[PDB]
C-alpha cells in the first residue's frame, strides 16, 4: 500500500448548535489567522471516545474527491473537534422529508449520481465505508450532495443498511457497500421511509434470508427498482460496481421523468470550503 501522505491540521480555538445525540455538530465560522478569509464550518464534538474521534479525522483527512467531505482540521483545546465544510442544507434523510412535496424526479437521479461517484472514487482509495445511508449524504446546495461519516470506515451497526454476508459473516467489501447504496436509494425514492419500519433489528437476518426485500417505491418504474434489486442480490459480486451505478443514472438523468413519476414534477470575505485550497 502507498504511505498516506495526507496532511492533518491542527486549528487554534481563537480561530450555534446544529443538534446533537448519540455527539454535538456545531455550525461555525473558521478565520485562518492572517488570511482575509472566512470559511463556515461544522464542528463536531475519554479515552475511547477520543480514540474513535480520531480515526475518524484520519480517514475523513485522507479524502479529496468532490462527492465526499473532507476534515479541515482539528481542534485539540479540551475535546477533541473535528472542522470541516459547513453542508447548510443538512443531511439528505432530513432535507427529502421536509421538501417531499417540491423535489423533483432530476434531483432524486442526480444525487443517486453523485453518491455512487463518491462511493466509486472510496473504492478507488480502496476504502470500504460501512455506514452509507441517507442520514450520512449531506446537502451542499440541492444540486450538490457529499458521503461523510468515516466512523465505521476501513481499508477493504447499523443492520437495516447491511449486506446479508456483513450481518452473518462480519465479511464488508466494495460490493456490501453497493447494498448499503441500494438501501439509501429506497430512502431517497420514498422521500425518506424507514426500511423494515416496524421490524426489530434482530429478525432482519432471517427476513432476508427468506428473499424479503424492500418493496418497490410508488415514484419508481420498474428500471429503477430493478437497480436496487440488483444491490441486493445474496452473490455480492452480482451486484452493480459503484462505476455502473454512475452510468445507469446517468442515463437515467437525462430524460429523469421516464424513470421516476412524480406528481407536479413538472459576510465580506465569506468563501467557500470547496474554493479554499
Ligand atoms: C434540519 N436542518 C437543521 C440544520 C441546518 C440543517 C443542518 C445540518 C448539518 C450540517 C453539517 N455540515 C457538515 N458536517 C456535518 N456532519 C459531520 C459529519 C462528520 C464529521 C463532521 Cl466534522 C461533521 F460536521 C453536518 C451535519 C448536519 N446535520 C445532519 O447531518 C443531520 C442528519 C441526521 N441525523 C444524523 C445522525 O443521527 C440522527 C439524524 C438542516
Known sequence: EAPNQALLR??????????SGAGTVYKGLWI????????????????????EILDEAYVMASVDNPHVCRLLGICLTSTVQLITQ???????????????????????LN?????????????????VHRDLAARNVLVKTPQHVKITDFGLAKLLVPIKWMALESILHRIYTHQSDVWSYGVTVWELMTFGSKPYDGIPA????????????????????????????????????????????????????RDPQRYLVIQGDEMDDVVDADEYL
Not at 491542527?10 to 443538534?19: A, C, D, P, R
Not at 470559511?39 to 475511547?48: D, F, W
Not at 444525487?111 to 476504502?127: F, P, S, T
Not at 419508481?220 to 444491490?231: G, L, N, P, R
Open 10 to 19: 491542527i486549528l487554534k480555538e481563537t480561530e450555534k448548535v446544529l443538534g
Open 86 to 108: 459547513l453542508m447548510p442544507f443538512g443531511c439528505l434523510l432530513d432535507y427529502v422529508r421536509e421538501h417531499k412535496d417540491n423535489i423533483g424526479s432530476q434531483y432524486l
Open 202 to 253: 434482530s429478525e432482519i437476518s432471517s427476513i432476508l434470508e427468506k428473499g424479503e426485500r424492500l418493496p418497490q417505491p410508488p415514484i419508481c418504474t420498474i428500471d429503477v427498482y430493478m437497480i436496487m434489486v440488483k444491490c441486493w442480490m445474496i452473490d455480492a459480486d452480482s451486484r452493480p460496481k459503484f462505476r455502473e451505478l454512475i452510468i445507469e443514472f446517468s442515463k437515467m438523468a
Open 32 to 51: 485562518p489567522e492572517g488570511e482575509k478569509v472566512k470559511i463556515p464550518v461544522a464542528i463536531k464534538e475519554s479515552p475511547k471516545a477520543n480514540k
Open 111 to 127: 444525487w443517486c449520481v453523485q453518491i455512487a461517484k463518491g462511493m466509486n472514487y472510496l473504492e478507488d482509495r480502496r476504502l
